[PDB]
Symmetry: D2
Subunit: 494 residues, 4 copies
């Protein structure tokens, strides 16, 4: 049961958030954010740059000073605040889901039942961790008492993408705040609105001024200002592999701040001959097409055993042809438009490359509408490992189906990639499942399912898909500093 | 590759071990220990009673005094001592394996390749834990610094059975010593020899006097004296459910000492129709017959799906008929004699009980030799849940095979038992394996295998099979006391 | 800011709670609960006995069946339910604090700002643990995949005392429900009201019928029925050392159910010569007199260094003389009446004993009013270790002041006790603090403070003060069963 | 008791170690390693460069292949191998200590009693961790079974400095090998010998070929090749802050390999007026002068409270003047030469800068011998924060003594640094110790002691002193990859 959406939600926040106050950019400049379903400008938003980042960093540093309200606050109380924030987001769920759809393009039904639900679950999960991430008392040699304190890392710069605006903001705020850090967040230029509204809720929840600061703006300006800042202790980045390299170099060239990266992928989804056919087809469809194909862990290489290849393909094509593309506010819409014009064109370019290289176009392949950035659900069959569409992240509704024969063969082909974010295996056999989950070089391996995320389970990639993890207890590590205190004692006893 | 055994190993230790020295019982009484393969007395052993236990507890208490060598010793050094003990045991491996077989009856090849290997692995595993079981620093509300110290419980009474003499001794000493406790061990009257020789190695390894004290003797005397002692802080017991009750009652009626119990079982081994037949038959045989059937976790209820029942039974009977029973020092021997006359008679009684209640005797069913306590591998078919042989622990070479139709049905039947030590499932299906491992109410569930123990994995029972665990990190909990220290500080900061 | 109390709160719940419904006792019998401030009957409460306990256990067992709503519920949702209960309790905070004061006797200001605050913080802390108590994946030897599942123990019997009705209920429900167990709680006959009202909130919060069942009644009847029940998996008991022994014996004599105990103490509060005089005096007063002296961890052995003894005593006597005893609903009242006539007489008897044995009566020593169970704040000086009042738990407003000379002396005297629940050290010296905190044999050692509890920090005693812990992560151990699942795999790799 | 050293130990290993074999550099080029006590060449060593690093990486990658002996080896066995390596190093303890002193310059007595002892303790500690670093089973929402596997990161490049040759190699190999990774180590050009001999012991211990590969050579050649290698998964660097930046940039510019840095510091050692004078003076001396002042965590900023400044300085000067500088093989020698000519000159330059900026030269200040690189123990008084010697790491026998008045003041001055490796506090006061340990921004804070390291306690820096940690359980995090496996199950239950 989904409440009727306001297809034209009002925008209340569109400025820079610092010290719980709204500010215009120092330059007074603004940039437009577009509704991808219509191609029309929603509103103007303050264009933050270096000077604005500097103001935000100083406010974060001030809020992080020893003896400040945020530093003195009981850990259990930080949890109370995260829970309060969640309650506020839930109060405004119908509104936020509509705003998310308007700015991003994803179906309102999904924004409401999925994105918003996950935001709530993630913040409430981390609220619980606030007073539970213990340090240790260590039995070192000699007459000493030794223990560790798990202290906050400090001023954390967080740069997020546009595919899951509210969820990415929650994935970053949750562990950072639970562990007592202060934040300077740079939201994506394509989707800054929902995050800004949440900042209003952060203030309402009672978080001390300076604890969370949000600077909307571009990458080479605001984003780079955060990465190269001399007083930013750590930077968490989620986005393209290309910018990930830029971020790591900026950190090494500035103050050696700590860096964590969540990059893209070209995740293999392996269908063994003994899989449940109906289930495997629907899951492989979901694996690739979810969120207009704009998922880092999208199952973009669908490997199907030869004995079931023909039937699997035939059913996959039928499902892709039946997928409803249209107005994201319409309850029947399964697929909305791509996020912007740049992405829209990039996808069309990859489709053209697929055709040129000899992949078999089975359905779709072009624009789905005259207005907005809509693309038809596209399926390529007989894809080979050396093809561009089999190697590069398309980030669109373009499915690649490859044929294989043996389990030893598919392991090697699946692993022959510079990416290692996720992978999946569909089979009824115990031994095959264990053999594959162990052998696949990926941060997450799903068995008989796909895109199953939980605030409790970590999500991080291997190889060039990034470093470190998000969600779960592991997510707390990157936001913690370890201090060992070793005290001389009169006579140590067990 | 097994070294030739000395079939008549000399006995060097047969007294009470206290403060690293050998003592006769205060009464000067001795008891004979019998070789179960011949029915002849090996030698006499000091018969410890209450007064001897009192001496041992006082020695253990003195060695646990604050400032003592054992209390001041670095945790890493306790690990060094455990590793040294393991090296000494390995040096005398061939001798210990033969002495184990002489007093217990198990095949020398098994004593050498299994028992001794597992003793070495247990001690070395625990040596590694000595300096890694950390306490915690806790983010409590207010201006305080709060942390916990993981201290030793103190004087630990350990009462062990006779089925795995050396191994049970190691399972008890490993975690207790790794955490800095002191021990008063009461070994089984049927198999005291190997543990007394290890005491000699404990002294040789460098353990301070009083850290380990061993008192051979009977149960209602020496064992009860430990359970009811006013200065024993904890008692660990492994044996019959019946004596487990007496122990817990003795603890409650004396000084409320902490108690952990490892009792018996009637473990269900479930063979689904899609299982690997050959593997399942051999493993089911091993699951029940291992160690002359004297295993707490013996797969004494073999449930077989109806479609493969006939074939499974036919193959199980052939395997049981081919099992070689004889002199345990002979390399061809698969099964030695039962531990003693009492058990021998108990098993014969159970065999007769099975015949009387209508179970189908398929093979064996009688005495296998003139001398010693040898029983023929026995298999009962068409066993029903309400039969006594399907409910009570026989602890002998007597197999029960039951027929079932569905997975839902077998779950209920397998769980309808007052015991819950272990269980197993043989199937090739992923979902059946996961459905069963979750649904089975047992401490350990094996999938496509049986009796697979690792020093790293915990082992404990559910229901009336006991409480607490042994092996792994979990085995350290019962040997640790948690002290919280909460300090007022000028101003608490994250 | 404390809201004006309803000095005569209406009673809405006074029956047996089973399956989210109210029931009279099978016998139809009821017992009166008295207001300790007036000595008058508040109302009648159903008198649960064995047959009632039998009904509650059956309800709990049914609610725990595999596939039930409580068993299938996501761990995170158990957390949501606990947070909801907390919210309901906060909504009815004013009412609950008043009802607590009416049935128990403690000052309403304290019930509201201390007890209710702690109930909320306990339930909210444990709600956060629901989905965070992980099992392990273990690198066992050989070609196997081994892991542990932390499952609920099952039907947990919880018998609680009268000193902190609401808090004791929270301390028990929090960890038990966070881990998915079902409960059959037997509240104290002296204070059954507030717990019964919370049962109504449990139902309102949405917990499935049978998850929490409450049986008001007497000890030897309802309490013993739970301890000896054949289908209760675990029993947690908080109360007298005497009954603790009965519980452990009942468990061993019945079904070997798991047992944890929290008994009394005779906690030493050590004031060194360099301590802050003013702080130490107020804290020692608090340590002993808090909650009408009805605390298990009361600092009932105040050790004071000779050089500051005279001054400390002088100041301690003045503070005791100024302590306001009267109507608990009056904002000026610091000390309410003792819980009942039995306790009232026991305390007066101890005071007589103190005078007979030569302790120096410095103030108080008699009845404080002709109505209710009020006792004057009493202080005994020059107390010696061998005195009855220095060894036995008085549980009243009777303070013992002892003189000592050296640090080695005080450590031994503090440790020369059958109890070991808590201890405290007041000093400005680093080394003295560390020397004492390590040497004192107590579950909790406070430094420059007393009675500092946090939901995050564990609380459990040493020696005869109990076994196991409550609060913190450690509290989850006793409510968890560990299952090892070991699966044969094709080829294990790191 | 230290065995008499061989003052001219023979060199057995001086080549590149790959696949358990010795190779000359592909270019055939060699470089001389100098004895810092005489200034003479000890021997030539193969000069590894990019091509050699390429061979090492291929060897490491081949040893890491799924199905390889190293990958299939039981975790417990990796522990056995580390323990065996430790035994071999202990067998050759006397020789190794001598060789260390010959190549490095530190006193032989220290090499034997400190360095070798810590190497043994480090390796044995990590051997224990091999089969104890568990993954987790997670209670995620929905009908799924989710767990994590802690897998090795893979090919780890390790670049180490010259101050503690053997210990640095151990600190690196211990955690890397315990977690199943493979190594390509680049030892310091100034001290390559001991590491190369240990490589021989690694082969003897039984480690599979290619698990550990050592490439002696220069930094911009061999070092940079590892940091920029496309097939190196992680790089761990210990050294100058300047090269740390180079490493991080090379990583971001190459394959986004994971990076951990262990840089220098300017650690504050704070002496409060209530400190034990004699203890504080000796410890402050040790803090700074240890290992020729060549310690990253050297107490190079000795803050002394004004009331005790004069006496402290006076006593410090006396101690520095009596410190014996000479032949490291002579038992009376407390300080040997500096590692090389470059360091020797840099230190002399800093002493010159100290005199020029107005620091009061109290003793020493020049060359201590005609031969080798010996420098007189130098002490500067009245040092100000803005001085060069007060800000830059000198890495020599040059002590800075600063005066302060208040605790609040020293906290600010101590923290006003770009570094944050360590700090110390000398005081008898409990509150002062807790106030400072919390307030100091450093990875390690010692209280009434200095340079207290334990294999159990983690060691890592804050700010520009590095990221990540070494030693303890924390040291395993950087060498582990986390894989999440999420499996669809029929019906999840608690
Ligand atoms: N859990 C097991 O691994 C295990 C082991 C051996 C036997 N059992 C079961 O026990 C049945 C009977 O064998 P048992 O008589 O040798 O077992 P048991 O319980 O009597 O003896 C085991 C240990 O406890 C000591 N003990 C005996 N009476 C005692 C007492 N009153 N107080 C304290 N300690 C006492 C024994 O001397 C021995 O050391 C077997 O047939 C089998 O079913 C179980
Ligand atoms: Mg870009
Ligand atoms: Mg018996
Ligand atoms: Mg009573
Ligand atoms: Mg350099
Ligand atoms: Na937009
Ligand atoms: Na025997
Ligand atoms: Na009452
Ligand atoms: Na050198």
């Amino acid at each position: 049961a989904v409440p009727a959406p306001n297809q034209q939600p009002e925008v209340f926040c569109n400025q820079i958030f610092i010290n719980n106050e709204w500010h215009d950019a120092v330059s007074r400049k603004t940039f437009p954010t577009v509704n991808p379903s219509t191609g029309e400008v929603i509103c103007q938003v303050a264009e933050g740059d270096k000077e604005d980042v500097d103001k935000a960093v100083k406010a974060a540093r001030a809020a992080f000073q020893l003896g400040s309200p945020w530093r003195r606050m009981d850990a259990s109380h930080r949890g109370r605040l995260l829970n309060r924030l969640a309650d506020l987001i839930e109060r405004d769920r119908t509104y936020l889901a509509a705003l998310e759809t308007l700015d991003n393009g994803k179906p309102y039904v999904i924004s409401y039942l999925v994105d918003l639900d996950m935001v709530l679950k993630c913040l409430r999960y981390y609220a619980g961790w606030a007073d539970k991430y213990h340090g240790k008392t260590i039995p070192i040699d000699g007459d000493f008492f030794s223990y560790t304190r798990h202290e906050p890392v400090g001023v954390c710069g967080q740069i997020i993408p546009w595919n899951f605006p509210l969820l990415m903001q929650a994935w970053k705020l949750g562990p950072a705040l639970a562990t007592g850090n202060v934040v300077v967040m740079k939201v994506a230029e394509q989707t800054p609105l929902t995050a800004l509204y949440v900042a209003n809720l952060i203030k309402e929840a009672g978080f001390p001024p300076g604890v969370v600061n949000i600077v909307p703006g571009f990458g080479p300006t605001a984003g780079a200002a955060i990465a190269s800042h001399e007083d930013v202790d750590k930077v968490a980045f989620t986005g393209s592999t290309e910018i990930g390299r830029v971020i790591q170099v900026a950190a090494g060239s500035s103050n050696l701040k700590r860096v964590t990266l969540e990059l893209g992928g070209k995740s293999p989804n392996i269908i063994m001959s003994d899989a449940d056919m109906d289930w495997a087809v629907e899951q492989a469809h979901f694996a690739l097409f979810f969120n207009q194909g704009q998922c880092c862990c999208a199952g973009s290489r669908t490997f199907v055993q030869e004995d079931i290849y023909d039937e699997f393909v035939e059913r996959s094509v039928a499902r892709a042809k039946s997928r409803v593309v249209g107005n994201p506010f319409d309850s029947k819409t399964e697929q909305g438009p791509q996020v912007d014009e740049t992405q829209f064109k990039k996808i069309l370019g990859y489709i053209n490359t697929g055709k040129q290289e000899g992949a078999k176009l089975l359905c779709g392949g072009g624009i789905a509408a005259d207005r907005g950035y809509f693309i038809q659900p596209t399926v390529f069959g007989d894809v080979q490992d050396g093809m561009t569409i089999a190697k590069e992240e398309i980030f669109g509704p373009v499915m690649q189906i490859l044929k294989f024969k043996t389990i030893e063969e598919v392991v090697g082909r699946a692993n022959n990639s510079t990416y290692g974010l996720a992978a999946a295996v569909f089979t009824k056999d115990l031994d095959k499942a264990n053999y594959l989950s162990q052998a696949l070089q990926a941060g997450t391996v799903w068995v008989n399912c796909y895109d199953v995320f939980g605030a409790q389970s970590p999500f991080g990639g291997y190889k060039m898909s990034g470093s470190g993890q998000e969600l779960g207890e592991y997510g707390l590590q990157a936001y913690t500093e370890v201090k060992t205190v070793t005290v001389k004692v009169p006579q140590k006893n067990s």
